[PDB]
Amino acid sequence: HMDEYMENMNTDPSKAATIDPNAQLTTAQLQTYGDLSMMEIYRNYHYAFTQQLMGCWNTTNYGGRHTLDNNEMSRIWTSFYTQSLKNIIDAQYRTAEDAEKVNINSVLRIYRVYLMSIITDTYGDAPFSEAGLGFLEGKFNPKYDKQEDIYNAFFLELEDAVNKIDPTKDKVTGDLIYAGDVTKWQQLANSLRLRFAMRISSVNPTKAQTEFENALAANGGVITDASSDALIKYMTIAFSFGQEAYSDYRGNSLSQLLFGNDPANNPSYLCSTFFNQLYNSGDPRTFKISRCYYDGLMSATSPDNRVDITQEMIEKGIAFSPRDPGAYSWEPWPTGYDSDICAELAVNNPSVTATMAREVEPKLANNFLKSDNPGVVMTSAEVKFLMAEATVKKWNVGSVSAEDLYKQGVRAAIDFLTDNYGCTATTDAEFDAFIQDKGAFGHTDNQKLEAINTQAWILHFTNPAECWANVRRSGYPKLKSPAEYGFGQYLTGGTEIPVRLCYPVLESSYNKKSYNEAIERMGGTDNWHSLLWWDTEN
Ligand SMILES: [Mg+2]
Ligand SMILES: [Mg+2]
Numbered sequence: 001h002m003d004e005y006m007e008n009m010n011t012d013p014s015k016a017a018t019i020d021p022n023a024q025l026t027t028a029q030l031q032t033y034g035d036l037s038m039m040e041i042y043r044n045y046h047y048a049f050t051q052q053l054m055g056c057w058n059t060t061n062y063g064g065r066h067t068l069d070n071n072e073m074s075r076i077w078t079s080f081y082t083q084s085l086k087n088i089i090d091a092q093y094r095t096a097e098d099a100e101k102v103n104i105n106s107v108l109r110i111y112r113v114y115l116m117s118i119i120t121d122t123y124g125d126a127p128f129s130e131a132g133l134g135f136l137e138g139k140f141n142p143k144y145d146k147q148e149d150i151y152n153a154f155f156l157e158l159e160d161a162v163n164k165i166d167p168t169k170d171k172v173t174g175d176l177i178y179a180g181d182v183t184k185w186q187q188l189a190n191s192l193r194l195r196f197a198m199r200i201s202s203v204n205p206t207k208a209q210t211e212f213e214n215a216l217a218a219n220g221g222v223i224t225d226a227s228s229d230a231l232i233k234y235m236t237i238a239f240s241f242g243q244e245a246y247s248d249y250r251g252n253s254l255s256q257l258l259f260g261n262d263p264a265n266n267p268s269y270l271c272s273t274f275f276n277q278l279y280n281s282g283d284p285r286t287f288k289i290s291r292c293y294y295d296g297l298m299s300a301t302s303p304d305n306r307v308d309i310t311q312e313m314i315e316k317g318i319a320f321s322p323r324d325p326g327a328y329s330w331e332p333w334p335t336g337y338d339s340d341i342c343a344e345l346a347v348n349n350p351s352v353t354a355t356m357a358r359e360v361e362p363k364l365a366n367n368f369l370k371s372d373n374p375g376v377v378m379t380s381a382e383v384k385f386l387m388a389e390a391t392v393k394k395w396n397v398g399s400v401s402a403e404d405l406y407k408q409g410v411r412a413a414i415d416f417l418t419d420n421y422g423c424t425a426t427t428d429a430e431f432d433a434f435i436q437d438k439g440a441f442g443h444t445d446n447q448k449l450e451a452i453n454t455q456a457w458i459l460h461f462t463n464p465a466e467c468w469a470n471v472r473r474s475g476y477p478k479l480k481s482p483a484e485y486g487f488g489q490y491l492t493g494g495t496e497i498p499v500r501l502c503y504p505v506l507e508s509s510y511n512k513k514s515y516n517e518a519i520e521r522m523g524g525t526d527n528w529h530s531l532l533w534w535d536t537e538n
Pocket of ligand 2: 520523524525
């Protein structure tokens with residue numbers, strides 16, 4: 001089926017919805033979190049590997065118990081190379097060096113870098129420079145570019161893009177991140193430069209510092225307040241898991257999937273690592289991100305009519321039972337209680353029970369289960385954390401103290417929930433009480449890097465690609481294998497939490513030489529325990 005492979009991996013004008021560059025951008029943006037098939041990878045792997053969710057069958061089975069599954073691992077590769085990245089490549093190619101299309105071209109180059117970053121931060125070496133060119137240039141069988149070289153190209157592409165943007169030129173018309181404000185595109189591009197500079201800070205400290213400092217000084221500057229956060233706009237659409245929903249990117253499919261195809265039996269239960277970080281630190285977001293719900297009246301298609309038992313649990317002294325890494329909602333079975341709230345519901349309703357069991361395991365709050373939840377690309381809060389870490393590393397990034405940058409990042413991360421998810425606001429007094437106690441910055445460099453990156457991990461909950469990248473890069477939080485929680489007997493894929501995903505096996509058939517050459521650079525095996533180039537330690 002080389003024919004289908006070739007058709008699917010290159011933009012075919014005769015079959016493609018459109019080759020208009022502005023339209024290509026719109027559809028690529030929506031795909032990022034709108035592709036319901038692709039989002040399975042995050043529920044299956046990332047959210048377990050970062051120990052944020054655990055207990056849903058899918059999360060625990062795949063990532064929580066290290067089940068290697070080449071088809072499940074393939075989703076980012078397939079989805080991006082056969083749709084958004086290929087289409088962005090086609091659009092970029094057609095607008096390159098056209099003086100009348102410098103803004104759309106520059107924006108395409110920025111978003112091309114962003115999508116490619118997700119691919120390389122998942123798999124390592126991957127097609128980039130030669131990708132998507134079969135119909136444009138007759139160039140098939142693209143080489144897998146080395147990750148080091150991909151990162152070099154990120155910095156160069158982003159720099160050139162910010163230098164070519166000119167608000168006097170072409171209008172960017174279907175842009176669901178910034179409604180064509182190309183100044184905000186410059187801010188995003190320079191912020192991505194910060195992200196990628198910090199990413200390479202362990203493997204190449206000299207280059208990291210230089211790129212970080214270059215980005216701060218670059219045309220348009222960086223994202224310095226939340227109004228320039230890069231968030232893809234999604235519409236409210238009913239959640240459907242019928243066959244036609246898999247081609248509908250209008251709604252946030254990550255939110256759909258975290259609600260679930262089986263929402264009553266397999267909701268998004270929180271992992272103990274994350275719930276306990278929040279709860280034990282008195283984090284104001286504990287019960288903004290999570291609640292305990294009884295779902296006996298909840299429909300199969302939306303998180304309406306759930307019964308919030310969180311406050312009753314607290315009043316009655318019932319312990320929350322978040323899921324350790326490796327645990328299912330049913331294993332170990334939690335200690336429950338008889339609910340007064342649910343007993344009232346049970347009056348003259350045989351559907352309902354008053355006896356809570358798995359309802360004592362914290363669940364993702366309804367605010368994060370909406371079709372119109374944003375698609376998070378990058379935030380001002382993250383920029384603050386990157387600046388804080390650069391400052392601890394003694395880079396030359398301005399006059400603000402590392403501690404103040406850190407505190408600004410935490411405040412922004414908390415406010416992000418208020419502004420974008422309808423969560424209850426956090427007051428100055430609440431913020432100060434937290435930052436003065438368990439949210440404090442710390443005294444030693446290691447304490448400070450731990451605080452920064454732990455706070456980043458919480459911020460990246462809604463951005464699982466970046467969450468997993470930053471956990472691997474920074475080493476924080478320090479996570480233990482499911483083996484350390486009692487689940488070692490089940491870890492078929494090996495004891496250690498995976499640090500990358502393997503290449504799709506069909507690459508062996510359809511791009512064999514390139515595939516074999518990439519695998520040879522890792523020593524000749526394709527192993528999800530192999531560290532990526534930027535990832536210097538497990
Ligand atoms: Mg690492
Ligand atoms: Mg070998």
